[PDB]
Amino acid sequence: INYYKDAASTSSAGQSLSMDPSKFTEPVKDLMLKGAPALN
Amino acid sequence: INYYKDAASTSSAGQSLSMDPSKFTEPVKDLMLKGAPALN
Amino acid sequence: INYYKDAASTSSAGQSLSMDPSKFTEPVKDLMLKGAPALN
Amino acid sequence: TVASISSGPKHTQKVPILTANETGATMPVLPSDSIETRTTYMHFNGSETDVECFLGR
Amino acid sequence: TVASISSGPKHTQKVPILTANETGATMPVLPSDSIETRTTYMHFNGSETDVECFLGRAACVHVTEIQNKDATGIDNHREAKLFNDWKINLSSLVQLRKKLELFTYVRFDSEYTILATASQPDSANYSSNLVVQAMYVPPGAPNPKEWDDYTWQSASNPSVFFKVGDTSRFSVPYVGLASAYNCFYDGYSHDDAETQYGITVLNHMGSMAFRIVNEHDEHKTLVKIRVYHRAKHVEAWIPRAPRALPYTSIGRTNYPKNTEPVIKKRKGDIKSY
Amino acid sequence: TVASISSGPKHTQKVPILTANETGATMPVLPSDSIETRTTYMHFNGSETDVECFLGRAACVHVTEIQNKDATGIDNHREAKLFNDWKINLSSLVQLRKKLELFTYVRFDSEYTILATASQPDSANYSSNLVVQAMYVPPGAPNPKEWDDYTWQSASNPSVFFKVGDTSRFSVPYVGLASAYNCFYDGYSHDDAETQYGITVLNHMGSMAFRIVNEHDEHKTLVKIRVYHRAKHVEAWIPRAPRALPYTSIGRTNYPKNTEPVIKKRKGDIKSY
Amino acid sequence: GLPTTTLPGSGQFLTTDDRQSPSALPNYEPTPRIHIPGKVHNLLEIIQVDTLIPMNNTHTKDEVNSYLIPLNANRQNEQVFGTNLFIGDGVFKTTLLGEIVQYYTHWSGSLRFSLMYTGPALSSAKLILAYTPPGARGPQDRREAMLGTHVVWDIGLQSTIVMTIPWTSGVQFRYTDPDTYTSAGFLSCWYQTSLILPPETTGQVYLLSFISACPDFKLRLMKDTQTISQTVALTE
Amino acid sequence: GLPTTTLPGSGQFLTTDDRQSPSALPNYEPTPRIHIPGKVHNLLEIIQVDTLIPMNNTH
Amino acid sequence: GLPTTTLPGSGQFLTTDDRQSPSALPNYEPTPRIHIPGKVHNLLEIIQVDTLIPMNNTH
Amino acid sequence: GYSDRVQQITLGNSTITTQEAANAVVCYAEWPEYLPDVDASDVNKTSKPDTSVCRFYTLDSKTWTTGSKGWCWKLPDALKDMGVFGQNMFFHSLGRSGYTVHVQCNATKFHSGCLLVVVIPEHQLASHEGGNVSVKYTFTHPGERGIDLSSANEVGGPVKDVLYNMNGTLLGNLLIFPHQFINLRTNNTATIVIPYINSVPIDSMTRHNNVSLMVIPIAPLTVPTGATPSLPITVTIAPMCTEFSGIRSKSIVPQ
Ligand SMILES: COc1ccc(N2CCN(c3cccc(C)c3)CC2)nn1
Ligand SMILES: COc1ccc(N2CCN(c3cccc(C)c3)CC2)nn1
């Protein structure tokens, strides 16, 4: 129950439960498959 | 939920969301169309 | 009504109403029947 | 809500920027009447300028 | 539920009262196996003997003390009780300890309650109003050194601010490394020839830090902190023999030498009533 | 969810453990690519590492102080701490600062908490009860000059009145000019040859003004204000390397000269354990 | 008027509680969000990116050189480097992994340790990396080392080798601040055959080493880092 | 009696909060509204009317 | 703002009361339970196991 | 027969071929794109010179020697003088751009050495003076010359200490930023595609640089016996999806 009118006044947000490290761990242009050779 | 009986005791009103500047910006008797000459 | 998000914050648990002393009072490998001889 | 629409070159006989202020009106001229604009949205309602808000603290 | 059924005379070849205790069992014998009984009902559920109930009331687990005074020229705040930590543990006070050690492994959430009262043992014009800060400094975190360190910013560490005379209350989930808390541990932290023995080597939940936020007034004020602990959501495994001798140390089973006989000697014979 | 799957001997032409790190990727190698594993489940969600959780607890962001005393003959209230402003910023204290600067841009609502406690360092008959007023003087608003200016009428400016010893609490929406708060800014406010460099030229959210509403009693009373800040509704973009050297200034990245080696030197060889 | 009773804890301020508050700026409209590449949601997302380990810690002031593990041509049987696995201390401590682990009290999971070789292309080498699970001492010679988790690495076209320290543990969580009961083992590396340089070439070659966490990883019970402190508030 | 806990901020007065209050004049009937030309709803309505700029500020 | 009245007993701490509290460690995930033989639920379960009586108390 | 190894990038009227690549990085896995209306604020139609600005400019070459500490360029600064890109830059009030960065360094199979090529969004530098000394404008706008981390401290300039990234963070952790290594034994180029990253939809190109490109030797250069002890490093950069807005008189900037 929100007792207040504005959105800033609500409690903390709830877990992204998004999670996708590939923008950070695999930003390569041509896809790399694990197990296939790195450099062909 | 109002806890009180009288109307003065309720919280602030809620946004007019009315908004019509023409009583102030265009109080002319004969309508002016933008693009048409001001004085004919 | 829980007012809080985490489970640790809820009140005491509610009675097991489990109760089974046999793991402590009769942990014998071959079942003993009351009334039958203890050692055959 | 659009804050500005897209508008391109103009070569008209219809000039929205020439007016006669002696009339007492403020003609509703916009950026797109005199330069070439691109679309943009308002993203805003004018909530905090409501008179209830202005006199309500 | 019947507590006793009706039972009459018996002249059988089926004797439920003769058993062999060498087997390790406690055979479930009842009054009606050996006298003539009448029906009676239980009228009772055994509600208040549930382990949740047994371990579920607040017990005092710790009393410490800090003072508000001018720290000017104090070379060791910790030592002046300008602030004080509490290497957290429940073995300190014996009442709750004997209760928990009826079990080998225990698992439960804790709901702590902190009462703080002030004392002004020497001439003051008044009673000041102090705010205590209690900050949980888990292992691996900077440890205060002064009573107003950067530490006390406690940007990542849960801390509660309450007023002396009031009480603070907050529960914490079960923060054991394992699946349950060991009440006993017959091991070492590694195969070292001189490393400690027992639980102590598991009890490593950090320490609680207390301090007054207020600067000093003209008089000195003693604030004494009492921490209460209530187990909620209790789970207990493997019952053990109750503690008979007195305790000597947090975390070891050791009893004092030349202790006194714990079994009351008869005033009379074996035959005495 | 499985944390590890079962995997057995391998004799392949398909080698997942040989890679080329020059590419910039971190290939997702697992225990089961190089040893024989058994199934195990995660039993865990990663809840407490969510950025909302990481930045979502209150951190102390500012400690200031004001006093209640007779202003008679004071030529500069601001200077007597009759009242005190706080050119608002979060770079002041380092605990929360290192946490935020793990990200480049951050966006979130703030929930501030203000604790005020009083001190009476020199002889008083009693402890008075003071009411603090905290008024947010955004940029472009009249700035107090005296501790009881027309300013403090604060007819259009949000202000909160609470009692010393108590706490005040109120949150404010994300009031950034941009779409997010910059944690870093490699720019200037204009192409001037001598204009400042860095964030400072963006941090322009005004300042918070504190004062006691009470007139003076016979003694003097020191009131020390602590502002706590909790981010709610957090959004963070572009992770960066954590801060290694100490901080020297609000808003610049500058570290101190002749600082000390931040990497611990081995006591022994590269070969040492 | 509805009858109430207040409980113990009333009026306290717990920095970790999460409740509603009045907005000081009623009706204010925040700036629209625009799109920005790079959003982070979990610290678990970022500790999977690998970063360099200053393994060569033996210097006396921080230098680019403590990131370089040297290799000697023609040595046989010998040991390249050694370290314990207290990820919250020592070599690991300044790495991004080390640096984040320090915001939490407990960790569990697998680690990924990789080595990228930088020697001339016409050279060759075979190294063995060994993980020694808790309970034994840091290995003292390859024979000892090779009886635990190990990978023979053959230096080739494929420049990096990724070793995983699989989670080997009784207790399901360890402390990030070094603790005995909770300790994780040792990591060592030895020549399997030996580094061989081509003609016209000379000197030491170096390996770069990285550390990142497997998707396996768990961190819990947040706390304050020993990695940052201060003595007076900063100002502008 | 229902159990409660009070949070930080209890008793504060925030000049910008918006809540209910008891009416001091229970049951009073305000004067009827009559029509008046000119009602303003938003300050945004009025800043669109143009006004003169003292551009020649040099006096 | 809803009107309330506080009753006698407000603010007391009764070591035996059972209510909710804020968690100090929001969002923390406890270690999984594994199976352990021997769980006790009631003290009534254990007082049915017999134990020896030092009847010969005369020492 | 496609290898990760050979590549061709054609952009405008200019083409690059590499026969020894190591894939390419696209920052944060996003490719440069123009500014959508939903994200727009300024009402001005923007100018998109296309092929006259989105081509490859090769900056002047650097020389890696055994004593090199590393070099740093800022964008869009480094290009402030390249062809029509630069003119547009000084002539509009606002502009926005992504880039393709191609760093080149070839040697032989007897050399060793490894460079880190990294892009840091919002790289705010530190003053070597400490305290709250600022870093003057000119110092953070080196132009095509970039900053040479082995040059001497100057007054009003930034600190040039490599183990600290010019800001109080450790060299070892730069790997959290989009980056690629050039290891003579593997690699001979590094290519990174940079999408536009800012907290505003469009900004000024002269008062704010939005990325620093940094090339840092990490494993020292080691040449074969009696080889000349140095290699040149060349940086070629191409603006991509560039848009300029708010045209006028032509900015005048310090120095
Ligand atoms: C021997 O059994 C136990 C049982 C519980 C227990 N702990 C002590 C630490 N405690 C704790 C945990 C988190 C925060 C705070 C303040 C205290 C939880 C209970 N310690 N030992
Ligand atoms: C560097 O990042 C940030 C992040 C948040 C922040 N602000 C400071 C000002 N603050 C604020 C805004 C409105 C009213 C009051 C009292 C304080 C909001 C958070 N400043 N810098």
Short mmCIF file of C-alpha atoms in Angstrom, two decimals, chain H:
data_model
loop_
_atom_site.label_atom_id
_atom_site.label_comp_id
_atom_site.label_asym_id
_atom_site.label_seq_id
_atom_site.Cartn_x
_atom_site.Cartn_y
_atom_site.Cartn_z
CA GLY H 1 -5.19 -2.84 20.86
CA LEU H 2 -3.27 -3.23 17.52
CA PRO H 3 0.59 -3.41 17.79
CA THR H 4 2.49 -0.60 16.00
CA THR H 5 6.10 0.59 15.62
CA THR H 6 6.92 4.31 14.91
CA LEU H 7 9.51 5.13 12.24
CA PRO H 8 12.20 7.77 12.00
CA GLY H 9 10.49 11.08 11.07
CA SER H 10 7.59 10.67 13.48
CA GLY H 11 6.50 14.01 14.81
CA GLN H 12 8.33 16.06 12.16
CA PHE H 13 6.58 18.99 10.38
CA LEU H 14 7.54 19.11 6.65
CA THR H 15 6.03 22.28 5.10
CA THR H 16 5.43 20.31 1.86
CA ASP H 17 3.62 17.20 3.04
CA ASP H 18 -0.15 16.89 2.29
CA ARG H 19 -2.38 15.19 4.85
CA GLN H 20 -5.81 15.38 6.50
CA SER H 21 -6.55 17.47 9.60
CA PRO H 22 -9.53 17.95 11.86
CA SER H 23 -11.70 20.96 10.89
CA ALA H 24 -11.85 23.56 13.71
CA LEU H 25 -15.28 24.68 12.45
CA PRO H 26 -17.29 21.46 12.24
CA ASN H 27 -20.30 21.81 10.07
CA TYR H 28 -19.87 25.31 8.78
CA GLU H 29 -21.18 26.11 5.35
CA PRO H 30 -19.00 28.21 3.06
CA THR H 31 -20.44 30.97 0.83
CA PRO H 32 -21.63 29.67 -2.53
CA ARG H 33 -19.20 30.27 -5.43
CA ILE H 34 -20.55 32.69 -8.10
CA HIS H 35 -18.92 32.88 -11.57
CA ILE H 36 -15.95 35.27 -11.99
CA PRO H 37 -14.22 35.60 -15.43
CA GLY H 38 -10.47 34.99 -15.43
CA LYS H 39 -9.70 31.76 -13.53
CA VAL H 40 -6.02 30.69 -13.62
CA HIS H 41 -5.12 27.04 -13.26
CA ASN H 42 -1.41 26.76 -14.10
CA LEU H 43 1.37 29.34 -13.95
CA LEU H 44 2.12 27.88 -17.43
CA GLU H 45 -1.08 29.52 -18.61
CA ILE H 46 0.04 33.02 -17.78
CA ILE H 47 3.74 32.98 -18.84
CA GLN H 48 2.45 32.67 -22.45
CA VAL H 49 1.02 36.23 -22.36
CA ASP H 50 3.77 38.57 -23.58
CA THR H 51 4.95 41.56 -21.55
CA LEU H 52 7.42 44.34 -22.33
CA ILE H 53 11.17 43.98 -21.62
CA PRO H 54 13.06 47.03 -20.23
CA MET H 55 15.76 46.38 -22.84
CA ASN H 56 17.15 49.89 -22.70
CA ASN H 57 18.40 49.38 -19.19
CA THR H 58 21.06 52.07 -19.51
CA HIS H 59 19.26 54.62 -17.40
#
